[PDB]
Amino acid sequence: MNLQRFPRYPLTFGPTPIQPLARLSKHLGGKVHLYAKREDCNSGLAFGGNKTRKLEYLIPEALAQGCDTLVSIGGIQSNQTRQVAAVAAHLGMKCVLVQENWVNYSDAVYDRVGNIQMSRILGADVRLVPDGFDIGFRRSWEDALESVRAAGGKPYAIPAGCSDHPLGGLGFVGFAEEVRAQEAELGFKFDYVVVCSVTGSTQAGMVVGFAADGRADRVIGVDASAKPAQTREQITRIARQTAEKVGLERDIMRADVVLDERFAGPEYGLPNEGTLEAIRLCARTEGMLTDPVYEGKSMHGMIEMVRNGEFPEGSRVLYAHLGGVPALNGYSFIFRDG
Amino acid sequence: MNLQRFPRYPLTFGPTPIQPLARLSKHLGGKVHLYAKREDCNSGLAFGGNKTRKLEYLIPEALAQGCDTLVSIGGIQSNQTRQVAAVAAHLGMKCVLVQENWVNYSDAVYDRVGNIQMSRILGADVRLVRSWEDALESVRAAGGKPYAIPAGCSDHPLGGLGFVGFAEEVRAQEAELGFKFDYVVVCSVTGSTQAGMVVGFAADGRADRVIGVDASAKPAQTREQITRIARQTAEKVGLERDIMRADVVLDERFAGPEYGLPNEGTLEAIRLCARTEGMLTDPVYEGKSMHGMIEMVRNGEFPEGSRVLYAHLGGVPALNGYSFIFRDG
Amino acid sequence: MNLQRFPRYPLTFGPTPIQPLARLSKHLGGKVHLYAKREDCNSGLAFGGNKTRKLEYLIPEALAQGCDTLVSIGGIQSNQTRQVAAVAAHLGMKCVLVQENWVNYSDAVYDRVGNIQMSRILGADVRLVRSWEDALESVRAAGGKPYAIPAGCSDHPLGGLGFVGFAEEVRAQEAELGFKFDYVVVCSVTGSTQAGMVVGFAADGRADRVIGVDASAKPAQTREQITRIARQTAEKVGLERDIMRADVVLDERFAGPEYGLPNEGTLEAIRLCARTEGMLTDPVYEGKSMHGMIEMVRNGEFPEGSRVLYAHLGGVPALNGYSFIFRDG
Amino acid sequence: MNLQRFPRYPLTFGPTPIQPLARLSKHLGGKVHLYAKREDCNSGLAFGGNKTRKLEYLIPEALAQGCDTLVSIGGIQSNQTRQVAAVAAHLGMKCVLVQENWVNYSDAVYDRVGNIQMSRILGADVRLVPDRSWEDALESVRAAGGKPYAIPAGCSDHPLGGLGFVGFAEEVRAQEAELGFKFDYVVVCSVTGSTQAGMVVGFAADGRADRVIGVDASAKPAQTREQITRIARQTAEKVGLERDIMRADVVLDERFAGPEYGLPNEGTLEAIRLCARTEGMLTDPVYEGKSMHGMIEMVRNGEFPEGSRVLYAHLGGVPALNGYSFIFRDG
Ligand SMILES: *Cc1c(COP(=O)(O)O)cnc(C)c1O
Numbered sequence A: 001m002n003l004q005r006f007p008r009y010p011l012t013f014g015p016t017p018i019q020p021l022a023r024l025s026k027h028l029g030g031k032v033h034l035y036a037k038r039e040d041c042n043s044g045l046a047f048g049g050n051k052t053r054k055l056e057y058l059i060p061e062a063l064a065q066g067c068d069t070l071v072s073i074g075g076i077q078s079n080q081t082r083q084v085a086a087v088a089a090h091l092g093m094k095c096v097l098v099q100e101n102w103v104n105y106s107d108a109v110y111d112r113v114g115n116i117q118m119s120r121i122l123g124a125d126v127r128l129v130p131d132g133f134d135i136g137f138r139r140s141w142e143d144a145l146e147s148v149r150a151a152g153g154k155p156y157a158i159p160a161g162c163s164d165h166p167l168g169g170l171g172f173v174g175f176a177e178e179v180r181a182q183e184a185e186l187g188f189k190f191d192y193v194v195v196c197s198v199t200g201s202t203q204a205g206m207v208v209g210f211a212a213d214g215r216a217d218r219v220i221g222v223d224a225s226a227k228p229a230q231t232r233e234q235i236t237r238i239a240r241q242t243a244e245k246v247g248l249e250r251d252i253m254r255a256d257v258v259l260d261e262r263f264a265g266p267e268y269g270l271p272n273e274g275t276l277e278a279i280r281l282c283a284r285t286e287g288m289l290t291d292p293v294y295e296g297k298s299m300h301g302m303i304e305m306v307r308n309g310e311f312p313e314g315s316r317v318l319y320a321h322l323g324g325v326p327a328l329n330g331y332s333f334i335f336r337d338g
Numbered sequence B, C: 001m002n003l004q005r006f007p008r009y010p011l012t013f014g015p016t017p018i019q020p021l022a023r024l025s026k027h028l029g030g031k032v033h034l035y036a037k038r039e040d041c042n043s044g045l046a047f048g049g050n051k052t053r054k055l056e057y058l059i060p061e062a063l064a065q066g067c068d069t070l071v072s073i074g075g076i077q078s079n080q081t082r083q084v085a086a087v088a089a090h091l092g093m094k095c096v097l098v099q100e101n102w103v104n105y106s107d108a109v110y111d112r113v114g115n116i117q118m119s120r121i122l123g124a125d126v127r128l129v130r131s132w133e134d135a136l137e138s139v140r141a142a143g144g145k146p147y148a149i150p151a152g153c154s155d156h157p158l159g160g161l162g163f164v165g166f167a168e169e170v171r172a173q174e175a176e177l178g179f180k181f182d183y184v185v186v187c188s189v190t191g192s193t194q195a196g197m198v199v200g201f202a203a204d205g206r207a208d209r210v211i212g213v214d215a216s217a218k219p220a221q222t223r224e225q226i227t228r229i230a231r232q233t234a235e236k237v238g239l240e241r242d243i244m245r246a247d248v249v250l251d252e253r254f255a256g257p258e259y260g261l262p263n264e265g266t267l268e269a270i271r272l273c274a275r276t277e278g279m280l281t282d283p284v285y286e287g288k289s290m291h292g293m294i295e296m297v298r299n300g301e302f303p304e305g306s307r308v309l310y311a312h313l314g315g316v317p318a319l320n321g322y323s324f325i326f327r328d329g
Numbered sequence D: 001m002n003l004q005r006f007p008r009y010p011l012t013f014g015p016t017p018i019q020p021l022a023r024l025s026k027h028l029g030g031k032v033h034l035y036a037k038r039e040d041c042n043s044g045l046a047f048g049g050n051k052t053r054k055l056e057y058l059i060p061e062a063l064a065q066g067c068d069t070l071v072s073i074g075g076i077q078s079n080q081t082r083q084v085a086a087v088a089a090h091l092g093m094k095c096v097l098v099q100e101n102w103v104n105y106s107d108a109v110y111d112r113v114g115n116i117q118m119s120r121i122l123g124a125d126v127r128l129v130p131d132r133s134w135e136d137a138l139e140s141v142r143a144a145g146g147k148p149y150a151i152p153a154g155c156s157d158h159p160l161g162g163l164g165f166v167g168f169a170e171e172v173r174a175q176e177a178e179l180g181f182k183f184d185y186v187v188v189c190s191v192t193g194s195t196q197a198g199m200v201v202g203f204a205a206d207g208r209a210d211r212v213i214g215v216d217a218s219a220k221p222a223q224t225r226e227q228i229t230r231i232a233r234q235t236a237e238k239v240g241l242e243r244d245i246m247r248a249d250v251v252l253d254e255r256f257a258g259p260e261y262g263l264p265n266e267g268t269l270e271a272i273r274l275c276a277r278t279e280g281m282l283t284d285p286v287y288e289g290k291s292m293h294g295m296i297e298m299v300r301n302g303e304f305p306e307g308s309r310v311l312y313a314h315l316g317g318v319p320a321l322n323g324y325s326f327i328f329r330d331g
């Protein structure tokens, strides 16, 4: 393949670090060696995270066209819209964010802390609609894009999670590249990668990047959508389009896309008692925080996989920390005593 | 001087990046070149920050001694106690934190979000209220050995080493850049961050270029504390000179109205910096130093052509305890 | 029967008023006349409500005995415990409250506003998680004599007396209005409210006119509690009859989806009633009985011309723990 | 005087009860007998309070004219706007409220709990401004085809705003008849002033005007005192007061208003706790907590004559406690 053909705008500090999770590994029995690649600490742009890696490939296009505004969308505690807001201010572009409560949840300060609080400080026009206002049905997405034009600007459309976008899967193809370039130094290859998936272009990019060396099925996606079927399909689809985009010379098989469905419950945005125990265990053994919406569910998955001996003894598992920690602020009551 | 003599435990990713703040500089007239050194992005341990750099030199001692518990103290939204809670967890040590409301503030979620929330998830025993002595005692009485970490790590013998290193790091990046920064803006409250810098740059004749921006709103005491720690740290590292009072610069114009409370200028600074650079600052610390730097460039207090290095010390998570203020941005 | 045999400690202003809900009635078709008996405005003690009418029959016993501390239990936004705290203060009694999270609901200020906030201001010892006996024992060991008040005051020998008195009061008021009510709608969870009503109205042949609306989301358990208590109370007051299953009507269609959680119908019912009558109801209890009453009317389940007495038991302060749901109305 | 010349629309249950505060009295030495008249419990309309008593004399006019919308204004945790919202819903009228940040306070749920939460549920169009709204509100109603009835801050600066509490003194006289004695003093919290004004006029009728001890909660003493005086004289002329309101007739203590309007001092807090714990009677940190603080300190300083009977008017305001949850987290 050839990813280098596509321009990458620097929005990160460079390659992200891999750290051993020795204490967690030892705590789980010592039979599996856990590591974490910190995508969550990749940028100075409002905490960055996986979405910021994806954005490096969309901005060149946004810039080539004469776009002066970035337009995106997401739920109230969306990490994506917060990263779009920071990237926009940084690039000197305006930003319009379409938002609605996409979770059956109602914390007293849900729309005023964490991610959304940052996007507002960052200068984004946060168009948060009232409950019952179904933006997706109403197609508010498009009216937002039209309002920018109508106002005299030129919008660049960034869909949910950056995923269903032609360039949305490139970033994580690069992620596989990085991983190989780093395994070169370790003198070994991680047997598995654990990654949280919802809109899909993260794991999709990984799948295309690791297919290139026969490890596509080593990417253990952990659904956090609670709608596994649609999510599995979205990752597959995005992976086949991206594979084509970068000239991979392999057809992505249904078997190349692994998405565990055991740790997504009860719904998108809601943690289960397992998610919570996972967050606390990982944080208390490594000083590494994860959230109740995304990373906490994929940490719950990994720890559970290990505990269930689903990992062949001696394996080295690379946990991809995609970010999302700021969302913890919207679930304060749950952690009031830790 | 000889800093290399003291053991530094790795708790950070490595030297912190220095980024240009091209848009902000342009916004303010372009007569001054602003940059930011990102201490707020130095670690994977619960967001880290300046305190984490300070702690790298205190940890070997805690370890050399048979200490099994890290004990610290700070206000409800203290960044320090949160970084200590994350280092403890990472090191396999227990953590006791003495938190008290050191601010005339009373937000509904003040003690449930941001820093303190992370400390509880990270497993620290968060005690809300001499509480200090009592905590230390309880650890021993419980059959443990505690390592006492004072407020902000500042009144600790090893507390100023971290930032002597910062100065060292800066000369090394200046070599690479092929140039040197003319000034350094840094927020100061407990004091060992600026004291460390003061000593570190006295080494090349730039202690007085370190521009401290008071955020304690009790300038006299803060200035004395930075002075004292700096002199003591200089002695610790074998500096050839005796730190003088003129080596310590502390602007008092941006600390209003009290510690922990932002003024309208603080909020405007936070908004301008975020909206021009995508770099967030908080209403307690960094927003005030950012306010100061901006005001300095604007009043034309920096000579035209200067290169100012803003030390971003962290603190962003505390933004969560000030949600009403920013409800509309 | 003779309720008069039992002492009643005055904790309310006196008989609660009955108001017509002409606007809501008109809005729903004008075929069914709706009224409201305001138990929610029955006392000067922190808003009172139905639990306060219950406590009037219990206090004498606590006093007969030399009790000095009232001890109760309930969820975090329990109305029962707030009223016990207020009754305690007014009596000069200590108060210990056992509060656990009985609801699968998480809101940042859930344990800091509304009912629990008042109980703390009122001086009660609010203990957040058998915690029950533990609390009682702690009182004794402390040197005080506790009076145990079970959840909602319901499963207690004197727990049904208050609402037997309610039926008596209603009769006296019907004599004054010159007409009788055909049905009463009442929210039910721990059961002694409806139980008292069942016993009081069985006396004039209208036990089955008391339309209970389940809010526990555990219909079977709640229906059994109402029956059990109604039988015990009927024996206490000398009712000349057995309480049969036909005497206990409990609608199950409106409790969803769980105890403490409103459904969309609950919310629409709270909004409709507030906007047509200026009478507020809450998302845990009254909003569900109000939803039930509105729906019964809408479905034509009440004969045309019926006069329906809605018993508003209180609970409004709990609205504060559900701020986000109502942020835009 | 003749208050009966003006119609009164029923929004309350009827006369408000007076209760002895025996425990609080004894707690303070037993030298002064304290009582409370419960204006805070006067209505089934979203808790009511003193503003609802005032509204009974304005609504007849709103109705006389062809008004279909009640428009009012107040701070974020305004009690006034909530009662207006409840009264409008009850009357079948629309309601538009102009809420501003009148307090230097920034609690996380300040604009979503308590009074303002109830106004939204009550169906009012609640208009907030990011950190002339009044005229835009009024015009917006006309433009929509309606007819607004304007209700100024606290109902005070209005021609009928003082009648409600003239009647309060009339009510207290009837109750004193049954009591066989007359109260020696009345303690009332004052901010926009027509509550104390109505009282000053009603008690002037029997030479007890200077017995109405207003307790300032505005932190702008001079301005509040002056507004009480003016509203009192205007009201006195409205009802036919046979005497004239003298400057000396308006008593307003300024020692308990601090540090600012909408912000409690530690004395306010102790007073709320003490009163709540000895009587089971709650007061708020903005208004009643301050007048209660006043009455307690007065008693404590022997400022009331031994044996005096002091009537504390509890005006309401308790729902605002939800906006100050952190200071009461441990009680
Ligand atoms: C968006 C996101 C994910 C999932 O990434 P997708 O590409 O949408 O599957 C996981 N974690 C965090 C923190 C995210 O913001």
Ligand SMILES: *Cc1c(COP(=O)(O)O)cnc(C)c1O
Binding pocket: B049, B050, B051, B079, B080, B152, B154, B187, B188, B189, B190, B191, B192, B193, B194, B285, B286, B313, B314, B315, B316
């Ligand atoms: C502690 C702190 C400061 C001030 O540093 P001192 O060494 O105490 O003077 C500034 N910013 C942040 C984010 C801090 O946590």
Ligand SMILES: *Cc1c(COP(=O)(O)O)cnc(C)c1O
Binding pocket: C049, C050, C051, C079, C080, C152, C154, C187, C188, C189, C190, C191, C192, C193, C194, C285, C286, C313, C314, C315, C316
């Ligand atoms: C307790 C309560 C109920 C239910 O009454 P029970 O006697 O427990 O069945 C209904 N409404 C409110 C407001 C309550 O506090």
Ligand SMILES: *Cc1c(COP(=O)(O)O)cnc(C)c1O
Binding pocket: D049, D050, D051, D079, D080, D154, D156, D189, D190, D191, D192, D193, D194, D195, D196, D287, D288, D315, D316, D317, D318
């Ligand atoms: C408005 C109000 C006051 C002050 O009354 P004014 O007539 O404005 O002087 C006192 N307490 C409460 C609860 C109020 O709502």
